[PDB]
Amino acid sequence: GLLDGKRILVSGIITDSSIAFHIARVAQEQGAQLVLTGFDRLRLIQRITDRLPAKAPLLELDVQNEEHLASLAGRVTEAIGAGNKLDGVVHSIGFMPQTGMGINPFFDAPYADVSKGIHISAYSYASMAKALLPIMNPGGSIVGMDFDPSRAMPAYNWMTVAKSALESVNRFVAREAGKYGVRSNLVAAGPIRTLAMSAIVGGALGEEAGAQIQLLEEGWDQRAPIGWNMKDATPVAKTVCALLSDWLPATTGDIIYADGGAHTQLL
Amino acid sequence: GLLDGKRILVSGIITDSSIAFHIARVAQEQGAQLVLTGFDRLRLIQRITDRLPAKAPLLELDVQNEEHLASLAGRVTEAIGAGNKLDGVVHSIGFMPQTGMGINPFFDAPYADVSKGIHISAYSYASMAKALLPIMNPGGSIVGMDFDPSRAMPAYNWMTVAKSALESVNRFVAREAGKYGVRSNLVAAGPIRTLAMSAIVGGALGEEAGAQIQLLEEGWDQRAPIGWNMKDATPVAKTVCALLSDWLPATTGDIIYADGGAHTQLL
Amino acid sequence: GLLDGKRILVSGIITDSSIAFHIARVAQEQGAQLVLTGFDRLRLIQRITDRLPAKAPLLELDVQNEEHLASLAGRVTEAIGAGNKLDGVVHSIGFMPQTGMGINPFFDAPYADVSKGIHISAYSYASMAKALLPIMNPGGSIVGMDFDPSRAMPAYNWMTVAKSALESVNRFVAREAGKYGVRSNLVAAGPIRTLAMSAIVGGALGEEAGAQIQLLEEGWDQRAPIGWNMKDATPVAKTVCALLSDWLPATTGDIIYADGGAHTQLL
Amino acid sequence: GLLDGKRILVSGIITDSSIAFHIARVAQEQGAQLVLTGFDRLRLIQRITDRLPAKAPLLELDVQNEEHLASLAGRVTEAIGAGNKLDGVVHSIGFMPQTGMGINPFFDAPYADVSKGIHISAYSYASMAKALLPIMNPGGSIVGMDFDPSRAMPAYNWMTVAKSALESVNRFVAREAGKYGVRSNLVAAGPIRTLAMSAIVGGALGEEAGAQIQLLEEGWDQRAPIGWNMKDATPVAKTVCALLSDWLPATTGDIIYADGGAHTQLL
Ligand SMILES: NC(=O)c1ccc[n+]([C@@H]2O[C@H](COP(=O)([O-])OP(=O)(O)OC[C@H]3O[C@@H](n4cnc5c(N)ncnc54)[C@H](O)[C@@H]3O)[C@@H](O)[C@H]2O)c1
Ligand SMILES: NC(=O)c1ccc[n+]([C@@H]2O[C@H](COP(=O)([O-])OP(=O)(O)OC[C@H]3O[C@@H](n4cnc5c(N)ncnc54)[C@H](O)[C@@H]3O)[C@@H](O)[C@H]2O)c1
Ligand SMILES: NC(=O)c1ccc[n+]([C@@H]2O[C@H](COP(=O)([O-])OP(=O)(O)OC[C@H]3O[C@@H](n4cnc5c(N)ncnc54)[C@H](O)[C@@H]3O)[C@@H](O)[C@H]2O)c1
Numbered sequence A, B, C, D: 001g002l003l004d005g006k007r008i009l010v011s012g013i014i015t016d017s018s019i020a021f022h023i024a025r026v027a028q029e030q031g032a033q034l035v036l037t038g039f040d041r042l043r044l045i046q047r048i049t050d051r052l053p054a055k056a057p058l059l060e061l062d063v064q065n066e067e068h069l070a071s072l073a074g075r076v077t078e079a080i081g082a083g084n085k086l087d088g089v090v091h092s093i094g095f096m097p098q099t100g101m102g103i104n105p106f107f108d109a110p111y112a113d114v115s116k117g118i119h120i121s122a123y124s125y126a127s128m129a130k131a132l133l134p135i136m137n138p139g140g141s142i143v144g145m146d147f148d149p150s151r152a153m154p155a156y157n158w159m160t161v162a163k164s165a166l167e168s169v170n171r172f173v174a175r176e177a178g179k180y181g182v183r184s185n186l187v188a189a190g191p192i193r194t195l196a197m198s199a200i201v202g203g204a205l206g207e208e209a210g211a212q213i214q215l216l217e218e219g220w221d222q223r224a225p226i227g228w229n230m231k232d233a234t235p236v237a238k239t240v241c242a243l244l245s246d247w248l249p250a251t252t253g254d255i256i257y258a259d260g261g262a263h264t265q266l267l
């Protein structure tokens, strides 16, 4: 077991197509004892997570709720038991209002919506680290989900800006995490066919947006020297578990690219 | 004159130590007709800008004020004359509340403060582009002021995150600017001894923060193969004018490093 | 005149489609006094360069010839006159044997051929800097021609590896150049339809290789927010002149992208 | 066992201080069946490798020897047995003549020495890939040792250029490796006190060189949020083993930084 007898918090499960679900699944398969956090639809998330190989306590976490973050460490300690600490934390949380994405013009996205997006997608990685580092063991690992924003691309728009902010936050979280002997890193995943992506490809945020994202997917597999399967989140999940493990102990404030090596090729 | 006959909006003058003041000065020296935008203390800015080689109309622009941005293009056209468009736009605007910087711990920065900082420092570049692109000529140039946030550093904290977000926004503005035949680029300047900068070195955001920024400055000059004078904004100002000129016509969504080449050296 | 009164050595003119020819043309148009350097076919280069706006002394330089480099500074001083120094140096030199490029498998390139390519394309930038820095004025500029090798691509193969080596060498040349008050920078140009480029598209280095280069140049124009005209070297030439000028005085060991902003966009 | 049942070739053991020795050690600890390759001093290498947890066949490989590379796959197949293939390949090979490093001026390095350096340090990664990919299983992994050359630094000089070339080669090897279902990645390690490094700090390549490398070391630990122990190669070894494992299956043509996160921080 890669994560044998490691206590790992996993956020960001909403459906069985969620990357976080596949992270949670592979984590438990490798002997990790999980604490799950969920947002808004808790009855749904509890039902979805019942299909995981092992049962895991589910805590409510809205990263925009200061009370939720303030109480989180206590609620996690209650779930995993007194005198026990976290060895792992997975940030798999991302949102951007429709106005900040798709055929909705880049300039027409009002800041109130962008701010909400940056709050949930970027700042939330710092606030999660703050809440949970006090209850994290030395040799611990914090991992966030990233989408390479080094270059602008159609439709992703302000979500790309939010990911650029996240990458920057990760490098600062790493500074703080370092004091606790804890690593902080992002996995830059290739495109994964979640509900949200499938909807976007289906034209949910306008036709050209779906068209450009479908062209982006196809270009991604073409470029990737080992190919890229957008319907298979397992390679991403295994990469998150690699960073949660003891086998990247000199990597922090950094980004691991689980993208089939697409970002290393132009074509 | 590098910018002979070019009409250029220049934001972000507050004092004569402002990078924007030195941009404005060098721009006018090179035959540019300037429109100035100023925030909050207009009587002050009007007095400061009277020392510029040529007199320039000063417009009020708070980038957080929706009415100011909505009205901006009209007020600019009124100043430069009907049937006349801008050839240049300088974003020299930046702010992060005290909580987002210095010895004020990175995790203790409330999002309301970080959001206000990202609004003025990152989003404002997109909203300035939205307002002004409709009144910009083909072959035009938009330039923003950047501080390399590729790597985390002490004290700069959430301002670095704000700069990471700005870099991402610039790449998207470039996509929109391209339709108007306009270029969008950032100048990544080295540390410049502004009033706010001197205050920070003086320990205005805590002793440890001032100590770290002073060590960062000294390391910057050491690394820079052509040295770095933090008391000389002229090389930064000349670099902005180079991007405002017709002499970088194939560069857009990009970053020019006016840092003495410090970012290209480890030491 | 951007380069009025400046004495600039320009290498790498072989035909009138050469980037160096357009660099030389734009430089002379901006009041630069040129020293030209040519390889092997001197009669040809002399004839081609007669079409430049002004006549310029032509010196033989094979960068693989130690005597040519040893004697260079002397021969340049004789041409521009004793007591006069160079203000500018353009490295527009590039070669990789057929085996190092095209459908010729990457692994099948003999090192003897790769080494010849790296010698001419990468090391020669350091060689030219060594020979010429002693006869260069303070505030001077050395500029090399680059093709972004940050990501691998089809056909370019070992030429990409050579460009990666050049980028690295440039950063070290900048350290040495710094002592002389001289800047060292690369222009990362987009694809330009030179004789060799046209031949390669025509299938000169195999059909599949020509097909991939044609898809690369087409993808380049699409990505570029301000488009990319591969038949127009003028934007590249103007960018070199910008670096040779006094208007990027805080940029060294660095890379300016004259690529229509293609490298800042994914699509 | 992380590498349970995996057959892995490991090059670049010369002493027990070698990074390759620690890679080899940690690999065997994790259930890997090793083939070792050695250069020049074979009686020494056999003696050194006797201290490894398990007995491993040692094959002679000079990467500059065409006969050695042509015969390698056969000699490896003989060692691991007919109908058995490699699941892993470790390139831990690096050399640059004294003239290419230290206080020996950057410009004074003759290309013959630089070419020899680039041959062993960069090209050899492609040579090993060519020889060994035919006898490598799907889901296989090739790993090379890298020192981040993204920024120039004192003393490392042409070895940095060689590492820049290696990074570029890796991205091309990945394209070829991809056809065999094999990944190709570099581990960018922080400075490790090998016999060679200890000698350099001792002033073996001049006093100023040793002084700069000692300042680089100390700055590295300072910057690294989780610190950096240059006397501990285990974190580098564990990182190579992570890439050799099945736990980074979507990472190829890429670079993993085993540097304490030093490359993510400025200070
Ligand atoms: N799907 C892709 O193609 C892709 C690629 C790379 C990176 N990512 C990143 O992966 C992460 C996971 O997203 P996904 O693709 O699995 O989609 P998803 O919708 O399944 O996951 C997003 C999660 O964010 C949670 N969330 C939203 N707002 C929240 C809030 N205020 N507080 C707490 N949780 C909140 C949702 O409940 C959900 O569980 C995101 O950070 C996303 O940006 C996505
Ligand atoms: N000084 C440095 O060391 C340094 C280094 C690199 C980049 N920069 C960047 O240079 C730019 C200019 O800053 P500076 O260093 O000249 O300092 P400065 O204080 O002189 O300039 C900042 C400007 O931002 C303006 N501003 C603040 N809030 C605003 C708002 N809501 N609407 C409109 N304008 C607003 C201020 O009025 C001021 O004119 C900033 O973007 C800064 O981040 C600074
Ligand atoms: N054409 C493109 O698409 C493109 C794109 C970006 C960068 N570049 C770079 O621009 C530079 C100029 O090449 P180009 O595209 O104008 O083609 P070109 O063939 O016109 O220029 C190459 C030049 O190299 C010279 N040269 C070759 N071997 C030499 C040697 N041993 N000593 C001295 N000079 C030697 C040739 O004589 C010729 O003048 C090269 O470095 C090339 O890699 C080209």
Ligand SMILES: NC(=O)c1ccc[n+]([C@@H]2O[C@H](COP(=O)([O-])OP(=O)(O)OC[C@H]3O[C@@H](n4cnc5c(N)ncnc54)[C@H](O)[C@@H]3O)[C@@H](O)[C@H]2O)c1
Pocket: D011, D012, D013, D014, D015, D017, D018, D019, D020, D038, D039, D061, D062, D063, D064, D091, D092, D093, D094, D095, D120, D145, D146, D147, D188, D189, D190, D191, D192, D193, D194, D196, D197
């Ligand atoms: N030690 C560091 O500070 C450091 C940091 C990062 C990366 N690296 C890289 O790690 C790798 C291993 O080097 P090291 O630091 O363990 O030092 P080392 O001297 O122990 O290892 C170098 C190895 O290269 C081998 N070698 C030299 N020429 C060869 C040839 N022609 N054919 C085959 N093998 C040959 C030597 O026999 C030796 O085993 C190198 O690629 C090095 O650049 C070193």
Ligand SMILES: O=C(O)CC[N+](=O)[O-]
Pocket: A094, A146, A147, A159, A194, A196, A197, A200
């Ligand atoms: O967030 C991302 O990066 C993917 C966009 N999406 O489908 O939610």
Ligand SMILES: O=C(O)CC[N+](=O)[O-]
Pocket: B094, B146, B147, B159, B196, B197, B200
């Ligand atoms: O804003 C910056 O990037 C630096 C100057 N400052 O205000 O601290």
Ligand SMILES: O=C(O)CC[N+](=O)[O-]
Pocket: C094, C146, C147, C159, C196, C197, C200
């Ligand atoms: O060298 C280059 O980058 C392009 C010139 N060429 O070989 O076609």
Ligand SMILES: O=C(O)CC[N+](=O)[O-]
Pocket: D094, D147, D159, D194, D196, D197, D200
């Ligand atoms: O090879 C390296 O990068 C480490 C320097 N050294 O001691 O050989």
